[PDB]
Symmetry: D2
Subunit: 295 residues, 4 copies
């Protein structure tokens, strides 16, 4: 039981300091109609850190209810750097009808590999839906080592893979050479194709908020091993893939979504804020080179 393919880390639009629930649903429908296989509510791109527990529940519910009747799945953001909370969020995600959960490695308190193992073991035992690990040491301050990922995959039936955001293709080789049964997922848009061509089985994308049809086609080409076409799209997307991180995600992608008229208000919750005017200009310029689908 897995969740793979072309996936989108959904932005959370704000209007007057509240979550825009109609817009959120409209953005999700747009992803569905462009060939996305799953959506990820309240991940990093969705500003998970600044959303209350109830806004958390609301976004997941909207995702679950919008994807009903389609083949698109809901991979819910549900993680924490306190295990008792991560377990609680996992349970709530399951209850809200999520198909599975994405669970980030504990940030800031830097647990040991043993602590990481016990953390994810607690979570995976608490629910009977698929759990995808998420490694992003640049944000968390810690790494889930290759050994710990493989142990967790083998010891817990519902832990089925890992989202990697670590800019380390050696590790991707290491992982799939020693445990080829796991689902490696790209969490780094610029290198979607290299991760996929080495046996990765999906992406959880930032760029796909803006260009869902391009990311969908990239992933599906790759899954069918049509690597010429997949590489072509990956090479085409490189500039937008890099510029969407000229400042910390999701600041550029929300700026881009706003400039494309896909969201009403360029609002963040502090400590996140509008990009510098310089980067705002860079994002605008790069956007001109791409064909953006509306609703």
């Amino acid at each position: 039981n897995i969740i793979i393919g072309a996936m989108t880390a959904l932005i959370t639009p704000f209007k007057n300091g509240k979550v825009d629930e109609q817009s959120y649903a409209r953005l999700i429908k747009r992803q569905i109609e462009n060939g996305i296989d799953a959506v990820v509510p309240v991940g990093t791109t969705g500003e998970s850190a600044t959303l209350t527990h109830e806004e958390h529940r609301t976004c997941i519910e909207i995702a679950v209810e919008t994807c009903k009747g389609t083949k698109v799945k809901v991979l819910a953001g549900a993680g924490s750097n306190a295990t008792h909370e991560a377990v609680g969020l996992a349970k709530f995600a399951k209850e809200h009808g999520a198909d599975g959960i994405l669970s980030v490695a504990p940030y800031y308190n830097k647990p040991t590999q043993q602590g990481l193992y016990e953390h994810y073991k607690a979570i995976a035992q608490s629910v009977d839906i698929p759990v995808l690990l998420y490694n992003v040491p640049g944000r968390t301050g810690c790494e889930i080592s290759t050994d710990t990922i493989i142990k967790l995959f083998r010891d817990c039936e519902n832990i089925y893979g890992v989202k990697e955001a670590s800019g380390n293709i050696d590790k991707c080789v290491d992982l799939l050479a020693h445990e080829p049964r796991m689902m490696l997922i790209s969490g780094e848009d610029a290198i979607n194709y290299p991760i996929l061509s080495n046996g990765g089985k999906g992406v959880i994308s930032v760029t796909s908020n803006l260009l869902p049809d391009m990311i969908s086609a990239l992933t599906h080409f790759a899954l069918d091993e049509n690597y010429k076409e997949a590489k072509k799209i990956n090479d085409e997307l490189y500039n937008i893939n890099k510029i969407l991180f000229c400042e910390s995600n999701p600041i550029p992608i929300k700026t881009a979504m706003y400039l494309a008229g896909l969201i009403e208000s360029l609002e963040f919750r502090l400590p996140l804020c509008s990009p510098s005017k310089e980067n705002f200009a860079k994002i605008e310029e790069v956007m001109k080179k791409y064909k953006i689908k509306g609703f």
Copy 2:
């Protein structure tokens, strides 16, 4: 600016059967006080803030405030978050419960820009009328408060009075005090307490002082008295214990040390933190043998 400086301790939070050991916590604070510590920091990183509840947060601060009352030892409360609205709430919370000031860590995980950081700490500084000390620890948070942002916050905001640095970067320490000599630079990295102090730092927020408060207190005060030879001697002697206390992520080794010393009853953490490996346990036990550990 009202300031909170000198020899300060990042308090561990003892657990017994999964609950905060409130009696033990009070006893440990009194031990710090009577060993020359000038301020205590409840519910910081070393206190496992990330796994404590709002209620336990409150309890710890209240015990600190109560134990320190009548002494002139201050309570620099842990109150920080990667959500600004939460950080503001925690700050007001700490003030309401008697804290003399707050230590507020740079937002972790969501990596705000320098502009976002400035506006984060500005919102915090405006919500309370008590001293605010910034806290930079990029290895844990995934972001850095630049010297420029620190200096601007210090100058623009009356109650922002300095920064706790845990970045292993003595170049940055020079930069800070060469451009803004009025700020209070605080060492948040025990192994280099003396170099930071000798360049004009005005205090430490220590991990090691949990175990050896008298030695850290002495180091700090010797430095403050410009007796650099005695301050350096102590810093040199403490190097071994200072490094071993980070063989695994803080506060895993310091809690192990306190338990081995008999200063806390149970070696308990809350997940995702846990006991050290058996090997690291033995290393900590060995290094401790070379130091005189004050009791209660």
Copy 3:
């Protein structure tokens, strides 16, 4: 178009016997590479202990390579590089004169030139010989990084600069390079990630592992070039373990130890500051070695 040296290539070790280059052994080693499908050999690279050879020994290894590859399709891509531009120009001239088909020229180490400096460094070299020049980026060893913009500028401004050997563990950069300059010959300088580099359109490898297992590195590269990505990945996955262990200590200390343990060279000798591995890494090398099928002479 350009004039190129691509495919499966070996960074030759330099066997010493009683402190001197064993020229007979060197030649025998090169024939072993040829017979096992290798497309080119790199004499006196990092893996050949370039730093500790004299100019004359440099000369000799290149001659042996060229002479042994005569009457075969196998090319000689000679190590010729320095952190001093005037020496680098000199070395490139020597290599040309002794029959090399091209040169491998490492980025200036230790003195950390700026990007402008790197551009002028390589321009000077490329305009001094008529033969192909492969850039070589390895920031972990040199202390500097040739940026993508600089590499592309050099490719476009100098006729005989035809690509770059990357040893930076940075697949993002590899995407950047070939997306903006698809004519570029991107060459893997990191055995562990040979397949990912080739699958993004890299056209060859300069390998350490191939000293010991030239048939496997050859097969991998040719399968990749023939767009059989299933087979190329399988061999890359199989080789991952030896590919990493060969770096348990700084290259070429493990590969030279492997070659000796396999009986492919007579003596295990290094030139200081390089030296034999710890006796435990020694057992580790023996261990991983015996898990692969090693071709003889």
Copy 4:
């Protein structure tokens, strides 16, 4: 026998591509007359990499001749990533009158700690003059570990300390807490005072090329345990200390020397070259805040 106090990593001025010997001697005289305790010919700052063996000899000879009759010492650059060459250069240096040698850790070929030990041991045993280790991992790609440094200091009588350029005050505490008899020398101008205040016994300076009187005063104030004055100069110097590394040393220091009229042309040897217009301008503006001694 040791070589400590305020020391200068001498630039090597070129005149139409050739070593400017008149300028070199002039510059050394200026260093001496401003309280410098030793000069370092043909180090990194002197573009050691691009000079020939004869130019190496020339520079050392000029330094030795210029210092004659004074107590100023010549600590000659003499090092290589090939041990047989490093030994040759060490002997060479002794033969031409150097008081001691500065010997950089092997660059590019990344020897093991064991190899580093045998490298420096061979050097130390080939000359009977002081040897100062030189650790600068950002340039070499390797690190002389604290243990290896202390081993070399203890095992070899004439190895008397290390020049550290690694931006790591933690390592400076480790070195001197365990081996207080060694001479720790600052190779990082910006943090000269913190290194000295922890028991360092000198500097090998880039900045002192431009401001020899200030670096000298800094160093001797600290050696006099007058830490207030030593820190005051270090704080005042921070801005020039930092801009002198906006591009790779010695590119900024030669630019400043040229701007100050201390050398008559801005010449390098490839692969080194002039700075960008932007950095050229920044260096000029930072210089305006300091009093620069003439001849």
